Amino acid sequence: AEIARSSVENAQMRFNSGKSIIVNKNNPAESFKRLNRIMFENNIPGDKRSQRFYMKPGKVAELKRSQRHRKEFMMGFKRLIEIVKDAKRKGY
Amino acid sequence: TLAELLGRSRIAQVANNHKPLTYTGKKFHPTHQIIETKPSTLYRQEWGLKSAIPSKIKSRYLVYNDLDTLERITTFEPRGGTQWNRLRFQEMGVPINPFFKKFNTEIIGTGGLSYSLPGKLKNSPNGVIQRTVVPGRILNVVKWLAAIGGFVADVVFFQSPPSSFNSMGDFIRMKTFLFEILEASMEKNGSVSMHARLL
Amino acid sequence: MRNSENKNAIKMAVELARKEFERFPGDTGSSEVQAACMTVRIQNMANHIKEHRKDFANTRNLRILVQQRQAILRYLKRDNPEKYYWTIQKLGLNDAAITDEFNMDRRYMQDYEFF
């Protein structure tokens, strides 16, 4: 009954949603920025618009392939730009 | 035959090394061989490598990984810093024996940093050099660490830090100090742990 | 063996059939031995199809295995007719079952009451 109330706080903190921040008293806006960072890292905003309407599985696969290809192309372009900058530094 | 000469050619003499040229981790010893070119060959961009190094490079020392690559560039860096550190150690005079009487990869004693022997002292026109003094820079407000002649050491103090330290704070590295190297030892991984005293 | 997988039991049965049909020790590729091993695996697959009648992939596999046994036994007939008749008699089959065109069509499954 007393150890009960001792353990209530630990038990309640255990069941964390994972989408939460303890506000910084000095700068409350910083905590909201951290929350928005969590939201964008979890793709929650894009996901919600994804579930809003229905998309045929073929179109979903087409979009997924396109997005993956664009991501890979961006990685390759960044690598090429790095090579360009290094060559410029060395005088090539 | 051609194979023998290629085996004995200076390009072959450089051991295979493929470590990252731009390394941001802890640096304890050289990782790339320094390639030197004479001024006459520098004028013509000849470094003894496969291809001509760009004329933008004015330094006479570089460290390289690939003679040639798919990008048609020589993978190099125009840096010859490490030798100076080694040479600067020779100016300190502090000595650091495996050099006296299946393959093991451990660093053998001092791996070419210093081949001196402990039992010698320096004569000077003033007289016998009892203790060697070199200038350095105290880096941070912490023991306290100092950049002394190419190596980072932990400085052993003598009573209290000078008040200049407290006044300057994080701008401490701007001012030079004079240290005396108490001792130099080599750790297993190749780090050179030196203990010095701020005079 | 009662606590083990069915694959182990079929392995033991295949070993027994091979050693019962082998011409000499170590003989595993003779047409009779191949036919016997195929027969054991075919019986196992037939039991599986009997308990799973909507598994069309394994029904196709069973059909292909039966046709493979037919082909190897037809070769044995063309090569060693005496051993061919001995093998088909031992396995419970006749000449017509081997030589005639066979597909596991719905007509077969209805006529022979596979399910």
Place this chain on the structure above:
Amino acid sequence: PVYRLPPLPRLKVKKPIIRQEANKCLVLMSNLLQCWSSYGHMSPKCAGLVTELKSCTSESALGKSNINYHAARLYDRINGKPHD
């Protein structure tokens, strides 16, 4: 892992981003405004800073990316296309 792009018509950044340095006058003005916000307007504490501003803006109130060029110049060398 390494990703290799196909033979491309060009190698160019759509919007090269340049590091313009914020004007000294603007940041000095901001510091003065924060000074008068905390200590108060015409406060004795930060009045010295005012002097700096009075000089820094006295003459005038306020007192480039070559990536595309080098990329276009170097692309034929570094793209790693097959011979012909």
Place this chain on the structure above:
Amino acid sequence: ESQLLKKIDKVFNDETEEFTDA
């Protein structure tokens, strides 16, 4: 059965070392 009772008593009734991840 005897070994079952013995081991169960050991693991649970006895305060043996338990595989609980810290």
Place this chain on the structure above:
Amino acid sequence: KEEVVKYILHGKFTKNNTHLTFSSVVEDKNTYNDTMLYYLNLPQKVKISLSTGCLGFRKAARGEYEAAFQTSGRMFELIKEKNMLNKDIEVVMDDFGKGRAAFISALVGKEGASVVKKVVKISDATKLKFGGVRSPKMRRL
């Protein structure tokens, strides 16, 4: 006995409107497992409920930025008016509507400057489908 462990301010920011709700978490001091189950999940009672229409905005004006901003300001003023700043507050935001930023600005700004001193945690309660009911078809506009 009904003591209030904390308060909870929830905001549902949909496309066409924003709904702000203030509530209190009541508690009753009095089997071990049932006491736990009560403790982890406390009862919740609504105290203040507002929508942009309550502020006078009509039709499409309900979903506009100013509507949400003024609704948040009126909300905070109302919690101050009924004197419910005595215990700490928990801010929950449901959806990424256009009034979510208005709520954030009103809260962190001068309008909610009194309320922000008592908030302790900000959480998200956005509801997502891992996989479920079919969504409406796309609108061919």
Place this chain on the structure above:
Amino acid sequence: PHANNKGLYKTRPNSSDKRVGVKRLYRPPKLTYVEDRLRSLFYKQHPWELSRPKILVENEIGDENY
């Protein structure tokens, strides 16, 4: 005519033996030298020897009399 390390006599060719190796003939052979190993050992045992500068300009190779 004898058994291999596993204890098996070679009686028939294996799969790798029954593949035509013309590409092996027409590839440029990789050149390997024993020194390349010891060198890698030496500069591993004495990393600071690397710091000593090296000149790769050959002078005259044929003139060496050592």
Place this chain on the structure above:
Amino acid sequence: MLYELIGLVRITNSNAPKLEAKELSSTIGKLIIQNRGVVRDIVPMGIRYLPKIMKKDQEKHFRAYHFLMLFDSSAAVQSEILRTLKKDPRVIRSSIVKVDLDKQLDRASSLHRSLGKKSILELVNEDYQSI
């Protein structure tokens, strides 16, 4: 066949949490041995708060005594054990996974195998085990 069972037993008596896990382990082991089975190991995992407030029947559970049982047995009685577990109010959650014995006859549990002890012989160590 080797089967690893991971049971999440409910804790109702706050003073003796291990009692219900003991009764469940006794029942399952008795079933396994009396139906021509073997109980290779019983690893007593500790008390842990459940990730969520999981619900079985009408009771809502927030914590559970986790436990593991590695046992060699046949498929039919394995399914029977699963059926008994699912309908038992005491077992909040249950899961039985095959541990393959194609290569090595003796294998440890997932926990010890993850630690690095592949076999139970390594668990009990090896001295005078070359006899």
Place this chain on the structure above:
Amino acid sequence: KIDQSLSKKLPKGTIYDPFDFSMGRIHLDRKYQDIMKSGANPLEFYARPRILSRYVTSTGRIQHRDITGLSAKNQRRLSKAIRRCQAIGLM
């Protein structure tokens, strides 16, 4: 005083060059800023919620192979083990 990110700390016993006491060194260091990569089987880690939780986000979303850096084999085993942990009541 100097913000810590604006200062470069040479560790003890490390060699350095004059370039190290420069903002360029700090920028370069910024630019170039476990068990499952050790030859282990992630499927064996299916009753181990902590080690699995190392490889998920705060919300529990499995991290991409670009983030984890695991091999495709071990990435697939990790995903399978995480989903199994979710199913069996753990995690």
Place this chain on the structure above:
RNA sequence: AAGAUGAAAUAAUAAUAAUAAUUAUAAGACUAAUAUAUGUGAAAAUAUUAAUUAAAUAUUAACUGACAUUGAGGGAUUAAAACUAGAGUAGCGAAACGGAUUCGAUACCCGUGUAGUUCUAGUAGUAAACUAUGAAUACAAUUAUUUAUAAUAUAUAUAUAAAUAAUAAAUGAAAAUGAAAGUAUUCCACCUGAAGAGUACGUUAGCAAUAAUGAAACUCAAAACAAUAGACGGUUACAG
């Protein structure tokens, strides 16, 4: 007051206390991250978890000794829609009923929403069922990644295979293909101008919708593919 929209309004949102919030019940359907359909499968398909059974990998050893390739007819499986019986019916949603927009709305937008989507037992056997590219065999110059094995001591930028990307030769009307659209061999299916026309008639099968097979007359000098230069776009971005 809520709900929706470009803005609105709807015979059945709310003062019978609605929307929103917190709980507690029942219902079905579906499966977020991982994720690349990488892979597996003959294709159709298939990624929430566990189990039972079946099948699928490489190397080595032993064995058979051409037992192989393709395959008319035939057989089996075959998305979505559809139908026949039962149950199910939370969302979505043909048709229908209304509200908007419009010169008109028979449409796009909005509301209620029947069949259907779901499960079981069947019928049917059609898709841009696509890689618009049938299967098998021998050969064919490179590079880069991975992917999977085999080693040797992270290092051999290690070797052997397959996937992917860009190519050489070759081929092609070109686009382009690139280890096949190349060099050759074997077998099968298909085509002979556009329209009439996959239409009519007949026949076969299905409960039916329909599916398969499938013309002819008449009309015409047309018809189509690739690429080129323009114009144009309620086509993008960059500058001025």
